[PDB]
Design a binder for this molecule. Structure first.
Ligand SMILES: *[C@@H]1O[C@H](CO)[C@@H](O)[C@H](O)[C@H]1O
Ligand SMILES: *[C@@H]1O[C@H](CO)[C@@H](O)[C@H](O)[C@H]1O
Ligand SMILES: *[C@H]1C[C@](C)(N)C(O)(O)[C@H](C)O1
Ligand SMILES: *[C@H]1C[C@](C)(N)C(O)(O)[C@H](C)O1
Lengths: 7, 7
């Protein structure tokens, strides 16, 4: 991954 | 806020 969120 | 990221 490497991005974040939260969805 | 309350959401995340990262931008
Ligand atoms: C999500 O990423 C942030 C940034 O590194 C960190 O501070 C949180 O503990 C992690 O859940
Ligand atoms: C989200 O990320 C910030 C930055 O590291 C941190 O301060 C919060 O505790 C984490 O939930
Ligand atoms: C991350 C934060 C958020 C977008 N407010 C959420 O609580 O809805 C999600 C489930 O986790
Ligand atoms: C959160 C993750 C990311 C989008 N890959 C970033 O490193 O570019 C940003 C600065 O922090």
């Amino acid at each position: 991954x490497x991005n974040x969120x939260y969805x």
